[PDB]
Amino acid sequence: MIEITLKKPEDFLKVKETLTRMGIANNKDKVLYQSCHILQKKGLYYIVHFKEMLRMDGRQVEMTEEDEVRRDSIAWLLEDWGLIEIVPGQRTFMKDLTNNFRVISFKQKHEWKLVPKYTI
Amino acid sequence: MIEITLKKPEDFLKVKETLTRMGIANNKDKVLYQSCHILQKKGLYYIVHFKEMLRMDGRQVEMTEEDEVRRDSIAWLLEDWGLIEIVPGQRTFMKDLTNNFRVISFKQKHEWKLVPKYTIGN
């Protein structure tokens, strides 16, 4: 998971809503699958892929490399966007190649079907 | 070991020479210890730490986290200067040249004992 500092503690919910609009798109039947979530654990904040949360609930699930590239590039994009800082000193994919994602704008939002993948 | 792209083949010896001039400086007897090397292997290029090369020769050496961070931040620095591009799709540390790090110019190098940590005996 990636350790994260937010600027102000309200922001957790802003970040949570923004992650709703970042994932694998099915641009044909306009469905977008949420990839990563924000969790606070033991006081520190983290960007977590949906599979790590499935792993946290006991499921023997393993991220793929495509999966952790996706997570690292969503975390780096929200940093680019100035919404999270990635706590210094972690080893991450900082240049993508392998799977990328779709970001939907807050007003394309309701035109799209937002489906959380955390095998609901 | 970090895979890198070079702008043109003759940039290899350019980087090989740059890496001799950046590392841990003992200024009281002016020795600069180089620790990262550029590698060509099957037509691809790599920034590699001397412990990965000692490792690659059969020695029982452990790269610490501190070694990987120095190697990656020297790859980031060469990238900032435009001598290389790190290849996308690799996990790296952020650039952080904290503890002792020094770059010495080309003109000034004749006063430094440039010393590869790779060849250091014992």
Side-chain angles (χ1 to χ4, degrees), chain B residues 108-122:
Chain B
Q108 196 216 151
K109 64 172 180 171
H110 57 228
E111 302 134 24
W112 292 78
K113 297 62 168 299
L114 297 183
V115 171
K117 296 259 223 274
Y118 182 58
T119 41
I120 289 192
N122 265 261

Side-chain angles (χ1 to χ4, degrees), chain A residues 76 91-96, chain B residues 79 86 88-89 91-92 94:
Chain A
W76 278 114
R91 197 153 81 66
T92 75
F93 291 96
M94 308 170 61
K95 313 183 81 196
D96 180 299
Chain B
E79 197 175 324
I86 300 175
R91 283 178 49 168
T92 50
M94 312 182 123

